Amino acid sequence: TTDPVRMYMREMGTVELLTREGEIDIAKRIEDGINQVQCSVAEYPEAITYLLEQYDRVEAEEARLSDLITGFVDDPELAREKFAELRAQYVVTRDTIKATAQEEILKLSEVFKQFRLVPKQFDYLVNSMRVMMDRVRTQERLIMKLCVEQCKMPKKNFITLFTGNETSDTWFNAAIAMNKPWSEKLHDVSEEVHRALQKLQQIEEETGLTIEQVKDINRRMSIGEAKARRAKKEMVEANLRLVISIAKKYTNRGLQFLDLIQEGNIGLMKAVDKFEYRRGYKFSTYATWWIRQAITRSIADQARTIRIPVHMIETINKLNRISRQMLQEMGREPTPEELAERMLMPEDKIRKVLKIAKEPISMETPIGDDEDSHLGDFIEDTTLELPLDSATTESLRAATHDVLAGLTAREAKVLRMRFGIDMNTDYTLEEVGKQFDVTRERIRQIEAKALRKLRHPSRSEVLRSFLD
């Protein structure tokens, strides 16, 4: 039946409700998911040194401590030491790559895993990772297309000497001599594939990892990431019903039903992010806060054609309440200066408050007769300037023009100058003095006599009439 409540009602009517346990099935998979990438991020060399380079920016005053970390597992003082510990395990693991390094690269990550980053930065690393994989993927694809599509070479035997390496020349210049149908063909593009192999083996240098490992990490990460959303999504879907039960409360507040539940559905999406099942608090009653938060935070925000600040909205609510105790209580209703007292504030602000608090009106409000005279039909244009006026103006110019020409050419320049008359700006009398070389008190006299001149008739007659 169209009406998007129906097709929504039905589409979420399919998704089945969670068991008391089922909330934990999904709660768990989430943790697995994140933790998977938390560990996938720990395993990155540039991800470590970056947090190092970034803290060295925080003690030298080119950032702040709130801008890098969100506290650890566990004070500016405490932070300094936790960082040495990290810096410490890095410097050991660093020189040890002579095997047993494995035992220590595993530890380096441990300390690194204690760090709760600002969500912003978290993503940056993640970002710098996938960006570097795109750079790897760029150079990987340049080597394949320059071989298979252009120089006519099978990808079946192209991947045989590739696995384990794809950096050195054991595949590039030593497999061209196998005298295969695609072997003598590979020489024409040899300048284009090996010269771009600069960024590929260089990634093993920046990131400090062979093209081998680089893919493995943010691959296991991608999976963890997908894994989590997959469960969170799932979690959300379970509770859409909850949103509705709540949103059914805030209906006529000036926002569409579905407008509510979508903002409330976003509360649900939130609560799913910040939740931990380990606090034994039911996802049910903990979610009702975040939703009922977002409902109201939205309502207050945008259900007005003239948006008003939040306190203002709350300031208002109190007021409708006070007239309630006192509506029947005072036989009629409390005076405009009555609630003023009930309220904490200036009490004349009542007038002030109460006025902006009005919603604008449908211009297409039918007025009397029910007839097609509508409100807007009566709203006159005030920005307009009527013709008797546009007329007098075309005319004042005429007069001032003639009155000033009938003057002395210097008294004209002097007058056009003191006033904005057919000139941009008007000039300070000194500004005027320098312009004629004869100055000061002088120009002010020339001026006054000119006015003095235009003041009585012959001259006076016409201009006077513009004054009403």
């Binding site: 169209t2 009406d3 998007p4 097709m7 929504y8 589409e11 979420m12 998704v15 959303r229 999504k233 799932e234 959300v236 879907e237 859409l240 000036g254 569409q256 579905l258 407008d259 979508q262 903002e263 559905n265 976003i266 999406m269 945008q302 054609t305 003239i306 948006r307 008003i308 600040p309 006025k355 902006i356 009005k358 919603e359 604008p360 009106i361 449908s362 211009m363 297409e364 409000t365 039918p366 097609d372 409100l375 807007g376 709203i379 920005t383 013709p387 008797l388 007329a391 007098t392 005319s395 007069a399 941009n424 700006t425 007659e461 016409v462 009439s465 513009f466 009403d468």
Partner: protein, 1163 residues
């Protein structure tokens, strides 16, 4: 030479789809926020629906932030907040946009009655809509597999379908999908595939449907449009000022409803941009999309859904589409007007007919700027601001000025229903003390003005063209003849005609009886001084004239035997008239004809001033007469009560018979009602015999009797007022009334108005009265609809060519309605121009030589001989395409000459016909529509489909087939007629195509088809006139014919060579184009056609100008259907040129449009 760039003057207008890139062309910034104004500093929030950054500054030539407030800086876009400083005007011009996240369906092209996106893909609506609400998936470019390109799958089906062929088959859902479908569709490709299918398989079910689509597509190809476009990426926003947020008093604001809508689109669009980055589950981002797809549609055309109601206000909010519509039809009241005013109207018999009585107070305000101008012209005012102050002061000086500015400066007077062109007329202003308008009495006729408190409006013709138009066209004096029927509309009214009649009337014996006088001059000297009675039989010397020479005046004196009155009156009459014209008693009829002939003999000016003399005089002597009315004036027949008791006994008779069962019950009702209806005719003709003549008076001898001088008779006999009909209710009994039923009551109202009515008699009088008022109130609403129908089908029609040079026309004879001459020949043919020369009874005798405008002498030279029928050119026959040649029309006008090039006759035709429409009561006014609507009748006759001998074959299967058999031709016509309707056809007899093969009414359509263009055209004109003329209404056929012309504007094809075979199209285009092959490319062939009768309501519906169309047709649908096709309106028609505010392409504008129309398609 370079064409141009900036603002020149346009002709033509194009409509089409808009690109997302195009919609971006318009915007000066993307609105990104649902914010309006700030809430404290009521300033506009950037960048939200109201903005300076995007749209314009809130105050003139002033930056928002206020850094730059100086008018010198113009092209400056201020550094703080991006605001170029220009008029606040631009906040009414500059648009904006919103980029949508997900694609969105444009509700017009989705739900406009025949879904365009639907039938463009050839895809059902309920399917496309399903794809949209994400209810089902649809394939797109389905590739080599299992699935149709437009086939639809279900969640579970799509799933399974995927497992099989991963890629190489593609399915989507929602707007993006449709958008996909459209993009891919190749119109060029589908054009070739659809052409093969047409020729291969032969079927009416198959190739009928086949053809209609392929014409539609290559339309869309050739259109310019791209199908994707119907799905929205970018959405423009209306400049704010048109959905303003202005403040009111007491400080509350008011705003357009678009803002509620717009805000909502913006919001949901934003919250969705948001959901995409949060990677929300599909169930929600889907849901959101749906809400956006809604919120738009409520914005665009609210109502093709569930109808979002405005905020907190139950009433639904006005969407853009509802912004366009305006106001059954449409109606379109609009345009208030400066320099205009009005008030109650009153009389002024002292006026010349070329002027009118206008209040000092009004004229001051109306001409105000003019006065300001004449004031400082002569120097009484130093400057305009002084002049304002002067006239504000109402300084005495100004009045002498105002009279200057007033003088030769016509104004327009217009009264309530503007029905014929005479509803507006221009007069020369004469200053008045009082707040009333003085309106010359002879015009009151045309205006249908009473003085019972009617008010009229005035208008100042400002521009020079407007003055001269008002003076040469709209002035009183030019319209003294009705444009509907060339009889004078400016005939003396009521007071004035009683006057002339009482003046030129005679009694048996009075002062002055029989003396003899030198001439009228001493006839008046005779009367003024109490010597002679106004009406006394007298021989006087008079001098008539007759210009009977070759344009030259002959004088004749004689002792005419006349009255003192008629003598006096001859003092008025101009020159070339006969004394015979004033020698009668001069009733309202004769008194008008008098005027008429004056015009037709001496020309305009002399009629004009004649007519004036008549009023003044008629009024004057009307006054002298002391006519009045008292109770004793209304004389009951002495025989009345007798007559009643006689017919009263008759009922007692038919009763005796009913109680005795001799007569039946129903039999009796109609019998009694007849004897009463009869008695009533007796009492009727009774009082009138007594009333009429029974003033019996004596001359020298004994006795003599004459037509009464009783106050009340004189009124009716003259025609000043009253009718024997009404009179009959005063003196004689008043009728039989009928109950609400319609069943006329068997005991009439036996009493009259001079007597009382009693309780029951009045109460019965009620119904007819109440129905009376009621009925006429509606026959008002009905006339009005009709006249609108007519102008809508007519309008754009104008005299374009001079002589289309056709020898063709229609044959005019008198009407002969069974009895005698319900309408004469002189009437039908006057002012019309001859098809072919008419001969005497003997011949080689050209009395009128081919086309000669048959004016009055001519009609008499015709009537001199016994001339019995004349062929005349009619508009319906005119060979001219796209207009009417002056010759085929006629002359008619309020001017007597032939119609000039450019006069917009369709209108005046419409007008002329519909105006009198109020006076009508099968039969009646609806009977007219039935005709003009070409409505086929309920139980029709059927006609001989072709000439030749007939017979019946097969039998009674509901229809016993009739098989006609032609002499030479093929036999194949067999039409199956119902044998349960009575035949008239002789079963073994030969029948002319168009004979009566049963009886009963026939559809005009047959008449057209079977009998011919002139036949039906004659059918219409006579049958409709049968209705009007029964009612005493005169409308020259010319008009009915122009409508008929428009009824059969269209035709259908039958041969081949260049056109579409089955298509219905304007004969204009054919006539031009078979003429464009007859000596042109190939004969090819061709083509033969068939003229088609359209009801006006249906004909009008087809009009070339799409703008014109949106006026009266349904606007949404017009625009869509037209917008897809990329249609161009080149204006040319009238409506549309007004709409768009440029010169009408008729009348004065005609000259202009023509001069420009040629500059086009030129060098």
């Amino acid at each position: 030479l370079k064409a141009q760039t900036k603002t020149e003057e346009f002709d033509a207008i194009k409509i089409a789809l808009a690109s997302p890139d195009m919609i971006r062309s318009w915007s000066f910034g993307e609105v990104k926020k649902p914010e309006t104004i700030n809430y404290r500093t009521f300033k506009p929030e950037r960048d939200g629906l109201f903005c300076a950054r995007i749209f314009g500054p809130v105050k003139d030539y002033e930056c928002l932030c206020g850094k730059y407030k100086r008018l010198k800086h113009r092209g400056v876009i201020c550094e703080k907040c991006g605001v170029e400083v220009t008029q606040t005007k631009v906040r009414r011009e500059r648009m904006g946009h919103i980029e949508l996240a997900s694609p969105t369906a444009h509700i017009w092209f989705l739900k406009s009655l025949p879904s365009r996106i639907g039938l463009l893909l050839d895809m059902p609506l309920r399917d496309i809509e399903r794809v949209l609400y994400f209810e089902s998936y649809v394939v797109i470019e389905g590739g080599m597999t299992n699935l149709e390109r437009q086939q639809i799958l279900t969640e579970e089906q799509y799933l399974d379908a995927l497992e099989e062929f991963g890629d190489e088959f593609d399915a989507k859902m929602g707007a993006e999908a449709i958008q996909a479908l459209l993009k891919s569709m190749d119109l060029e490709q589908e054009c070739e595939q659809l052409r093969e299918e047409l020729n291969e398989t032969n079927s009416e079910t198959k190739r009928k449907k086949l053809t209609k689509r392929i014409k539609l597509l290559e339309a869309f190809v050739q259109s310019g449009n791209k199908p994707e476009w119907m799905i929205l990426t970018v959405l423009p926003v209306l400049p704010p000022d048109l959905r303003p947020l202005v403040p009111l008093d007491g400080g509350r604001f008011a705003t357009s409803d678009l803002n509620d809508l717009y805000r909502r689109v913006i919001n949901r669009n934003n919250r969705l941009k948001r959901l995409l980055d949060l990677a929300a589950p599909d169930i929600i981002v889907r849901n959101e999309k749906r809400m956006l797809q809604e919120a738009v549609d409520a914005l665009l055309d609210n109502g093709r859904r569930g109808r979002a109601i405005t905020g907190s206000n139950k009433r639904p909010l006005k969407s853009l589409a509802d912004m366009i519509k305006g106001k059954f039809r449409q109606n379109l009241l609009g345009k208030r007007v400066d320099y205009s005013g009005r008030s109650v109207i009153t009389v002024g018999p002292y006026l010349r007919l070329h002027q009118c009585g206008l209040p000092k107070k009004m004229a001051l305000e109306l001409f105000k700027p003019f006065i300001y101008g004449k004031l400082e012209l002569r120097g009484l005012a130093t400057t305009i601001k002084a002049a304002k102050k002067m006239v504000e002061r109402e300084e005495a000086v100004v009045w002498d000025i105002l009279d200057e500015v007033i003088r030769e400066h016509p104004v327009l007077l217009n009264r309530a229903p503007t029905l014929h062109r005479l509803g507006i007329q221009a007069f020369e202003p004469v200053l008045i003390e009082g707040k009333a308008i003085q309106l010359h009495p002879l015009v009151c006729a045309a205006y249908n003005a009473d003085f019972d408190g009617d008010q009229m409006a005035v208008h100042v013709p400002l521009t020079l063209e407007a003055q001269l138009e008002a003076r040469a066209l709209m002035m009183s004096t030019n319209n003294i003849l009705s444009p509907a029927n060339g009889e004078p509309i400016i005939v003396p009214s009521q007071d004035v005609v009683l006057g002339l009649y009482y003046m030129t009337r005679d009694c048996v014996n009075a002062k002055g009886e029989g003396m003899v006088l030198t001439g009228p001059k001493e006839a008046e000297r005779l009367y003024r001084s109490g010597l002679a009675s106004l009406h006394a039989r007298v021989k006087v010397r008079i001098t008539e004239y007759e210009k009977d020479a070759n344009g030259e005046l002959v004088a004749k004196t004689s002792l005419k035997d006349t009255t003192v009155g008629r003598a006096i009156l001859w003092m008025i009459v101009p020159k070339g008239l006969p004394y015979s014209i004033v020698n009668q008693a001069l009733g309202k009829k004769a008194i008008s004809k008098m005027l008429n002939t004056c015009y037709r003999i001496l020309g305009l000016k002399p009629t004009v001033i004649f007519a004036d003399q008549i009023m003044y005089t008629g009024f004057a002597y009307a006054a002298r007469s002391g006519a009045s009315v008292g109770i004793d004036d209304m004389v009951i027949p002495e025989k009345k009560h007798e007559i009643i008791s006689e017919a009263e006994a008759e009922v007692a008779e038919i009763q005796e018979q009913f109680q005795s069962g001799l007569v039946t019950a129903g039999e009796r009702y109609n019998k009694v009602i007849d004897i009463w209806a009869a008695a009533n005719d007796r009492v009727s003709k009774a009082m009138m015999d007594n009333l009429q003549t029974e003033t019996v008076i004596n001359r020298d001898g004994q006795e003599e009797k004459q037509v009464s001088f009783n106050s009340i008779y004189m009124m009716a006999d003259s025609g000043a007022r009253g009718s024997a009909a009404q009179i009959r209710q005063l003196a004689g009994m008043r009728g039989l009334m009928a109950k609400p039923d319609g069943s006329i009551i068997e005991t009439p109202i036996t009493a009259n108005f001079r007597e009382g009515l009693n309780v029951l008699q009045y109460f019965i009088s009620t119904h007819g009265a109440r129905k009376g008022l009621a009925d006429t109130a509606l026959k008002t609403a009905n006339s009005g609809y009709l006249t609108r129908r007519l102008v809508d089908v007519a309008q754009d029609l104008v005299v374009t060519e001079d002589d289309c040079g056709t020898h063709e026309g229609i044959m005019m004879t008198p009407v002969i309605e069974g009895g005698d001459v319900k309408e004469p020949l002189r009437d039908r043919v006057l002012g019309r121009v001859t098809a072919e020369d008419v001969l005497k009874p003997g011949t080689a005798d050209i009395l009128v030589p081919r086309n000669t405008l048959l004016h009055e002498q001519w009609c008499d030279l015709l009537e001199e001989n016994s001339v019995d029928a004349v062929k005349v050119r009619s508009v319906v026959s005119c060979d001219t395409d796209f207009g009417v040649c002056a010759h085929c029309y006629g002359r008619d006008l309020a001017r007597g000459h032939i119609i000039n090039k450019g006069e917009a006759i369709g209108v005046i035709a419409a007008q002329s016909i519909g105006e009198p429409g109020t006076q009508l009561t099968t039969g009646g006014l609806p009977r007219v529509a039935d005709l003009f609507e070409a409505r086929r009748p309920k139980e029709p006759a059927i006609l001989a489909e072709i000439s030749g001998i007939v017979s019946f074959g097969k039998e009674t299967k509901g229809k016993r087939r009739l098989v006609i058999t032609p002499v030479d031709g093929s036999d194949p016509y067999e039409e199956m007629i119902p044998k349960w309707r009575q035949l008239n056809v002789f079963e073994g007899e030969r029948v002319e195509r168009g004979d009566v093969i049963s009886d009963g009414p026939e559809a005009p359509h047959d008449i057209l088809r079977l009998r011919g263009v002139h036949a039906v055209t004659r059918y219409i004109v006579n049958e409709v006139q049968d209705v009007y003329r029964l009612q005493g209404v005169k409308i020259n056929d010319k008009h009915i014919e122009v409508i008929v012309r428009q009824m059969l504007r269209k035709a259908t094809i039958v041969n081949a060579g260049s056109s579409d075979f089955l298509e219905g199209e304007q004969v204009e285009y054919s006539r031009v184009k078979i003429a464009n092959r007859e000596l042109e490319a190939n004969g090819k062939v061709g083509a033969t056609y068939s003229r088609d009768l359209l009801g006006i309501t249906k004909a009008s519906l087809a009009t070339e100008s799409f703008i014109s169309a949106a006026s009266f047709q349904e606007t949404t649908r017009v625009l869509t259907e037209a917008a897809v096709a990329g249609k161009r309106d080149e204006l040319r028609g009238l409506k549309e040129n007004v709409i768009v505010g440029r010169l009408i392409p008729a009348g004065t504008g005609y000259a202009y449009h023509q001069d420009r129309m040629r500059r086009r398609a030129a060098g």
